[PDB]
Amino acid sequence: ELPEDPRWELPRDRLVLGKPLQVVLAEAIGLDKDKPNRVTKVAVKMLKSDATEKDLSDLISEMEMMKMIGKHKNIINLLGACTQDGPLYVIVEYASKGNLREYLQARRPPGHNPEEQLSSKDLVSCAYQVARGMEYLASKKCIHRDLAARNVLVTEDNVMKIADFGLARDIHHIDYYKKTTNGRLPVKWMAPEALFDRIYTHQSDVWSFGVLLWEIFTLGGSPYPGVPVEELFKLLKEGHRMDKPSNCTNELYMMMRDCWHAVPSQRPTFKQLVEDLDRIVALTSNQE
Ligand SMILES: Oc1ccc(-c2ccc3c(-c4ccc(N5CC[NH2+]CC5)cc4)n[nH]c3c2)cc1
């Protein structure tokens, strides 16, 4: 078996497994020591049938990184684990409204008959919450390496939570040509120094955060639509920068451009971005 950790261990019989989200929705009974009769909706990460000892090592590594990083409102938090006498279950916060790309696309104005719409303030608030999560992760020396709307999850109460911050990635084993579930190329979020020289820093995460701002203000738009990997390289070498979204202020576009500084040292930090977004949220209208 695996070494037990009574900080985190939840008995297997307290976890009611549900539908697939390998991640499944579950109900945890008595997740809190001081509340044994409460059911909490949670997300449970586990191994598939075909999983190797590498796959199991990777899942343990992610869980250990989460214990190490500790709790923040704007990240997907570890809640517990089932490690003894059965398959490994890593129990994390459940975000009922899915990833931020989906959440934004679902709330586009009619064109599509959505039940809800977002104000300008709501969009900036989203950006602020992600910046604050990233400021926390950077403070714990965590480099995300794939910060994108697809890796931000939205809770029932519309809280933004950074996901997949603990993930094991062999960066020398990346397939630049492999597309996401949704058919997009993750290379389109990578800083040039990460992409060409495989150097990942908090500064390359700020570059990704610039692409994430662009996703927010396009309500889940696809960066460089129709651009293959070889053409993206030529664009980045030429110093191409994506156009300003409509319904994006000059100030937020300059923030995106600052995140996209060719010189990593000249990008704003997440600490900087949190302060600036805090000010902009307060001055942004929720009336449209
Ligand atoms: O290493 C990982 C750790 C956590 C997760 C993870 C993935 C999905 C969720 C979700 C989640 C919640 C709702 C959905 N929906 C289905 C599709 N859209 C509507 C809502 C999808 C995923 N909540 N919490 C999660 C944690 C994935 C990898």
Determine if residue 95 is labeled as part of a ligand binding site. Answer: yes
Closest approach atom of ligand 1 to CA 62:
1
Could you tell me the two tokens for 195?
Answer: 């992409």
| Resolution stated for this PDB structure, in Å | 1.7
Q: Are residues 278 and 154 in the same domain?
A: yes
CATH of the domain at 5: 3.30.200.20
Q: Are residues 83 and 209 in the same domain?
A: no
Report the distance separating Cα 189 and Cα 181, nearest Å: 16
**Which of 94, 110, 142 is the last residue in one of the domains?**
94
- Do 152 and 161 meet the contact criterion of CB atoms below 8 Å apart? yes
Has residue 287 been placed in a domain? no
Has residue 165 been placed in a domain? yes
Q: Are residues 222 and 254 in the same domain?
A: yes
Has residue 276 been placed in a domain? yes
- Do 93 and 26 meet the contact criterion of CB atoms below 8 Å apart? no
Beta strands in the chain (DSSP E): 15-20, 23-29, 39-45, 78-82, 89-93, 152-154, 160-162
The residues facing 15 across adjacent strands are: 28
Report the distance separating Cα 164 and Cα 75, nearest Å: 9
SS3 56: helix
Tell me, in angstroms, the distance from the centre of ligand 1 to residue 193's CA.
Answer: 30
Let me know if 146 is a catalytic residue: yes
Q: Are residues 265 and 162 in the same domain?
A: yes
- Do 214 and 221 meet the contact criterion of CB atoms below 8 Å apart? yes
Q: Are residues 181 and 255 in the same domain?
A: yes
Show the domain range for 65.
1-94
Q: Are residues 83 and 111 in the same domain?
A: no
C-alpha of 283 from chain center: 26
SS3 147: coil
Residues 6+ apart with CB under 8 A from 195: 187, 233, 236
- Do 212 and 174 meet the contact criterion of CB atoms below 8 Å apart? no
Pocket test for ligand 1, best of 25, 44, 59, 76 (most atoms within 8 A of CB): 76
Determine if residue 150 is labeled as part of a ligand binding site. Answer: yes
Instruction: Indicate the number of domains in the chain.
Output: 2
Has residue 288 been placed in a domain? no
Q: Are residues 248 and 173 in the same domain?
A: yes
Q: Are residues 51 and 191 in the same domain?
A: no
Q: Are residues 165 and 223 in the same domain?
A: yes
Q: Which of 58, 146, 205, 276 is catalytic?
A: 146
Has residue 252 been placed in a domain? yes
**Which of 94, 111, 143 is the last residue in one of the domains?**
94
**What dihedral do alpha carbons 130, 135, 138, 142 form, nearest 10°?**
-30
Report the distance separating Cα 99 and Cα 108, nearest Å: 15
Give 64-72's long-range contacts (Cβ < 8 A, gap of 24+). Answer: 65/142, 65/165, 65/166, 66/90, 66/92, 66/166, 67/5, 67/7, 67/8, 68/140, 69/137, 69/140, 69/142, 69/165, 69/166, 70/140, 72/132, 72/133, 72/136, 72/137
Q: Are residues 182 and 248 in the same domain?
A: yes
